[PDB]
Design an enzyme around this catalytic site. Structure first.
Site, PDB file in Angstrom:
ATOM      1  N   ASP A 154       0.843  -1.180   0.000  1.00  0.00           N
ATOM      2  CA  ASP A 154       0.000   0.000   0.000  1.00  0.00           C
ATOM      3  C   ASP A 154       0.885   1.239   0.000  1.00  0.00           C
ATOM      4  O   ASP A 154       2.056   1.193   0.385  1.00  0.00           O
ATOM      5  CB  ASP A 154      -0.940   0.009   1.208  1.00  0.00           C
ATOM      6  CG  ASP A 154      -2.115   0.961   1.020  1.00  0.00           C
ATOM      7  OD1 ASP A 154      -2.178   1.642  -0.041  1.00  0.00           O
ATOM      8  OD2 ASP A 154      -2.973   1.035   1.926  1.00  0.00           O
ATOM      9  N   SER A 155       0.313   2.360  -0.442  1.00  0.00           N
ATOM     10  CA  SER A 155       1.080   3.559  -0.742  1.00  0.00           C
ATOM     11  C   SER A 155       1.336   4.445   0.466  1.00  0.00           C
ATOM     12  O   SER A 155       2.199   5.327   0.397  1.00  0.00           O
ATOM     13  CB  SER A 155       0.347   4.373  -1.803  1.00  0.00           C
ATOM     14  OG  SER A 155      -0.938   4.741  -1.329  1.00  0.00           O
ATOM     15  N   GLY A 178      -1.149   6.317   1.913  1.00  0.00           N
ATOM     16  CA  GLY A 178      -2.139   7.384   1.992  1.00  0.00           C
ATOM     17  C   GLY A 178      -3.129   7.195   3.126  1.00  0.00           C
ATOM     18  O   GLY A 178      -3.540   8.160   3.772  1.00  0.00           O
ATOM     19  N   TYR A 179      -3.516   5.948   3.398  1.00  0.00           N
ATOM     20  CA  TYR A 179      -4.492   5.715   4.460  1.00  0.00           C
ATOM     21  C   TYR A 179      -3.882   5.940   5.840  1.00  0.00           C
ATOM     22  O   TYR A 179      -4.496   6.587   6.696  1.00  0.00           O
ATOM     23  CB  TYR A 179      -5.069   4.304   4.346  1.00  0.00           C
ATOM     24  CG  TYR A 179      -6.263   4.070   5.244  1.00  0.00           C
ATOM     25  CD1 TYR A 179      -6.104   3.580   6.536  1.00  0.00           C
ATOM     26  CD2 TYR A 179      -7.550   4.349   4.804  1.00  0.00           C
ATOM     27  CE1 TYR A 179      -7.196   3.369   7.364  1.00  0.00           C
ATOM     28  CE2 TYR A 179      -8.646   4.143   5.620  1.00  0.00           C
ATOM     29  CZ  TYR A 179      -8.464   3.652   6.898  1.00  0.00           C
ATOM     30  OH  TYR A 179      -9.560   3.447   7.708  1.00  0.00           O
ATOM     31  N   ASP A 206      -2.565   8.093  -2.798  1.00  0.00           N
ATOM     32  CA  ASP A 206      -3.824   8.811  -2.847  1.00  0.00           C
ATOM     33  C   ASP A 206      -3.964   9.693  -1.616  1.00  0.00           C
ATOM     34  O   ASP A 206      -3.155   9.637  -0.686  1.00  0.00           O
ATOM     35  CB  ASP A 206      -5.005   7.841  -2.982  1.00  0.00           C
ATOM     36  CG  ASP A 206      -5.060   6.811  -1.868  1.00  0.00           C
ATOM     37  OD1 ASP A 206      -4.012   6.497  -1.256  1.00  0.00           O
ATOM     38  OD2 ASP A 206      -6.172   6.306  -1.616  1.00  0.00           O
ATOM     39  N   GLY A 219     -11.614   3.474  -0.199  1.00  0.00           N
ATOM     40  CA  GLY A 219     -12.632   4.220   0.517  1.00  0.00           C
ATOM     41  C   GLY A 219     -13.762   3.392   1.084  1.00  0.00           C
ATOM     42  O   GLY A 219     -14.800   3.953   1.445  1.00  0.00           O
ATOM     43  N   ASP A 237      -7.521  -7.884   0.944  1.00  0.00           N
ATOM     44  CA  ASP A 237      -6.582  -7.923   2.059  1.00  0.00           C
ATOM     45  C   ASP A 237      -7.315  -7.487   3.310  1.00  0.00           C
ATOM     46  O   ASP A 237      -8.191  -6.621   3.242  1.00  0.00           O
ATOM     47  CB  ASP A 237      -5.367  -7.004   1.835  1.00  0.00           C
ATOM     48  CG  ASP A 237      -5.657  -5.543   2.198  1.00  0.00           C
ATOM     49  OD1 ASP A 237      -6.143  -4.787   1.324  1.00  0.00           O
ATOM     50  OD2 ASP A 237      -5.408  -5.152   3.363  1.00  0.00           O
ATOM     51  N   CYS A 242     -11.394 -28.350   8.247  1.00  0.00           N
ATOM     52  CA  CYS A 242     -10.185 -27.618   7.888  1.00  0.00           C
ATOM     53  C   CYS A 242      -9.000 -28.556   7.700  1.00  0.00           C
ATOM     54  O   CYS A 242      -8.795 -29.491   8.474  1.00  0.00           O
ATOM     55  CB  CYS A 242      -9.876 -26.597   8.981  1.00  0.00           C
ATOM     56  SG  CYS A 242      -8.431 -25.602   8.683  1.00  0.00           S
ATOM     57  N   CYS A 253      -5.822 -27.523   7.742  1.00  0.00           N
ATOM     58  CA  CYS A 253      -4.581 -26.886   8.153  1.00  0.00           C
ATOM     59  C   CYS A 253      -3.849 -27.722   9.201  1.00  0.00           C
ATOM     60  O   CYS A 253      -4.419 -28.609   9.843  1.00  0.00           O
ATOM     61  CB  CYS A 253      -4.856 -25.475   8.669  1.00  0.00           C
ATOM     62  SG  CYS A 253      -5.187 -25.298  10.439  1.00  0.00           S
ATOM     63  N   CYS A 271      -5.376 -27.860  12.764  1.00  0.00           N
ATOM     64  CA  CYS A 271      -6.545 -28.712  12.936  1.00  0.00           C
ATOM     65  C   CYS A 271      -6.211 -30.190  12.788  1.00  0.00           C
ATOM     66  O   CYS A 271      -6.989 -31.041  13.235  1.00  0.00           O
ATOM     67  CB  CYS A 271      -7.625 -28.294  11.938  1.00  0.00           C
ATOM     68  SG  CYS A 271      -8.321 -26.690  12.338  1.00  0.00           S
ATOM     69  N   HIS A 293      -4.319 -21.141  11.643  1.00  0.00           N
ATOM     70  CA  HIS A 293      -5.613 -21.686  11.260  1.00  0.00           C
ATOM     71  C   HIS A 293      -6.466 -20.651  10.539  1.00  0.00           C
ATOM     72  O   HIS A 293      -7.081 -20.960   9.512  1.00  0.00           O
ATOM     73  CB  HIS A 293      -6.384 -22.224  12.462  1.00  0.00           C
ATOM     74  CG  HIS A 293      -7.832 -22.400  12.158  1.00  0.00           C
ATOM     75  ND1 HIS A 293      -8.306 -23.479  11.439  1.00  0.00           N
ATOM     76  CD2 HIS A 293      -8.885 -21.567  12.342  1.00  0.00           C
ATOM     77  CE1 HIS A 293      -9.606 -23.330  11.251  1.00  0.00           C
ATOM     78  NE2 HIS A 293      -9.984 -22.185  11.796  1.00  0.00           N
TER      79      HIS A 293
HETATM   80 ZN   LIG Z   1      -7.515 -25.297  10.755  1.00  0.00          ZN
END
Ligand SMILES: [Zn+2]
Ligand SMILES: N=C(N)Nc1ccc2[nH]c(NCCN3CCOCC3)nc2c1
Ligand SMILES: N=C(N)Nc1ccc2[nH]c(NCCN3CCOCC3)nc2c1
Ligand SMILES: [Zn+2]
Lengths: 364, 364
Positions: free
Chosen positions: B92-93, B95-96, B137, B211, B261, B299, B301, B304, B330
């Protein structure tokens, strides 16, 4: 696989190297046990603990009986299943934390974060599923007087017999686990002897040296080890509880110690201290902000293969969890590499030279 | 490997699935980018981020320019080498955060944790070695008025041209990286259109919708996406910045968004919230103290596969770092599995059914 078989493969002076075979795996000695106080070695997955070379970790009766609870852990399948470490676990008995952290009769101790007795400590350790059970002792603060040292020691010896009997009364525990006695007696040679004699008469699988690493300084600790470790049965493991710095470990091995535990590599890693063969460094120091070298130039750990001092410096200064993870993995890996170099040098009959070479570079 | 090649393999309604090929790797879309604010995705090694399925992560110009510094990171070899992630990074630039965290002319902004301009933001992102560079921005707080929305938007469009020119003036950046423009205009259809037209006239590799996810509520966000995403070039990726909850992501994909994101899976994981196909759960709740099931029953992962709700409950209640590590792995894995199910269902022409089935179970 045997319940508990200690075999000494090589000696040099008072130093020994060998193996402890247990049902959940083999422990190479001299051994360092990472500390996993609340059913976790802080900031490491168990697979990462194993990757560093650890054969066994330490858990604590006092902490786990309060959170999450010993009966609860047993209902959930035992400590090994709970935290995901399937290798040996040694549990301390709770006697030290009862003194050091909580807020006392011949039967046991009542305290506020509950009751603890020899029989209750052994039962809790049974509920946890511990592989090496520690006898429950009565600890006294440092610096103890001769009167408080002797009185704590003699009660601890009576409690060692009660621990032995409770352990032997639990068939599953007696058949699958091992029991260690704890030698007390502070810095007094006579009491250390009386303690050693009492423990040897009862008979244990291994013998811990208690009451050290409480502020006595390395010279005095070594002086006590000089006469205390020869008092213990030679054919059984010798466990120095709560020790310690890398030079402490080397000198204790020179004096006959086979097993070690301490929070230093984990705790000081999270605080920014990294161990190197040239001595510890504090990675937060501004001199590391653009240092592209690894934490240590020889270390084989995954952290030193992948990340720079500069990055870890940034993480720790930013308060990032990955900073704690990486520092801790490196520090525990460094400790395991130290134990490996100790074991190899004893096996090869050059441990004396290793100790001298280690100290000359580490304190340069 | 190409600099930037977006290819749409399948469509269903407004939803698209495909790939962005870049020099450091391929990005499967719709994509979720874990956020790595201070050159780390909090509590995860980069190998673990990759293991969850992430193709690209997000870094931030504002944070890294303050700590550890953009010139310093460049001297150390770039952000990829610094943090150990060798795949694409979108930055990200700034600006936020200039608005949201710090304490403003046509040239740029001065602030206290420094100066930021379109040209300086692009240079910083060059110094970081970012693969997808965001145009700089001017952001306005929520809820913006029509006057503050239009004024921020029009300046942002002038700054988009300056960002484009600075990017194109840096040969190494132009040849190896990509540049995205940011559509502004708040919830006003006319301004969104004027913004889209201005960005398309300049020409960018991708188009972000700025925005949103600032407090407008899902209904209003969807209403804005309904008319705003059709305004963007169809043949380029559409990036919704800062979004969001799992249902937000599904509905945004239904409306043409390709990239996402947000800090929610990482931040709320450390706070005890775990995502499941039956909705989020707070693992600290006492109902999980003896729950041996994994965080989520389907899941895939590593968390899990290995640990119970009961253990993670204990870790988070104890404040243990491993609790944060496991919850975060997870949650990021859950998000990547969501994106995979979205991609497969669009490819197979059954995304509408997936969205309905997802929502019925997730909000049951
Ligand atoms: Zn998991
Ligand atoms: N006798 C026990 N049950 N525990 C014990 C003994 C010696 C120790 N030294 C330190 N140092 C901190 N912790 C120790 C714990
Ligand atoms: N226009 C930018 N450079 N940044 C940007 C835009 C929209 C965002 N929404 C949130 N939510 C928190 N963060 C955002 C960041
Ligand atoms: Zn290392």
């Amino acid at each position: 696989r045997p319940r508990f078989s200690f075999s000494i493969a090589a000696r040099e002076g008072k130093a020994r190297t060998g193996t402890i075979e247990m049902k959940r795996g083999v422990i190479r000695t001299p051994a360092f046990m990472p500390v996993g106080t609340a059913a976790t070695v802080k900031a490491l997955k168990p697979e990462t603990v194993r990757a560093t070379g650890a054969d066994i970790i330490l858990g604590n009766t006092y902490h786990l009986m309060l959170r999450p609870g010993a009966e609860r852990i047993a209902k959930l399948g035992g400590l090994h299943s709970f935290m995901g470490w399937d290798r040996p676990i040694l549990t301390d008995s709770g006697g030290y934390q009862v003194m050091s952290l909580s807020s006392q009769s011949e039967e046991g101790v009542t305290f506020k974060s509950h009751m603890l007795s020899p029989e209750r400590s052994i039962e809790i350790q049974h509920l946890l599923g511990s592989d090496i059970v520690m006898a429950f002792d009565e600890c006294t603060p440092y610096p103890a007087t001769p009167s408080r040292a002797a009185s704590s020691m003699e009660r601890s010896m009576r409690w060692a017999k009660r621990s032995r009997d409770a352990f032997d009364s639990r068939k599953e525990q007696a058949e699958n686990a091992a029991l260690f006695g704890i030698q007390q007696g502070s810095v007094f040679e006579n009491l250390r002897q009386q303690s050693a004699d009492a423990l040897a008469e009862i008979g244990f699988d291994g013998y811990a040296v208690g009451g050290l690493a409480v502020g006595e300084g390395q010279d005095e600790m070594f002086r006590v080890l000089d006469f205390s470790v020869p008092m213990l049965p030679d054919d059984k493991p010798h466990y120095l509880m709560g020790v310690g710095k890398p030079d402490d470990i080397v000198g204790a091995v020179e004096r006959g110690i086979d097993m070690f535990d301490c929070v230093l590599p984990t705790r000081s890693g999270r605080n920014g201290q990294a161990f190197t063969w040239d001595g510890p460094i504090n990675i937060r120091n501004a001199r590391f902000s653009e240092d592209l070298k690894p934490l240590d130039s020889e270390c084989h750990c995954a952290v030193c293969q992948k990340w720079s001092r500069a990055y870890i410096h940034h993480l720790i200064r930013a308060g990032e969890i990955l900073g704690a993870m990486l520092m801790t993995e490196h520090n525990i890996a460094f400790y395991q590499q130290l134990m490996q170099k100790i074991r190899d040098s004893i096996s090869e009959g050059r441990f004396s030279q290793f100790a001298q070479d280690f100290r000359a570079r580490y304190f340069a």
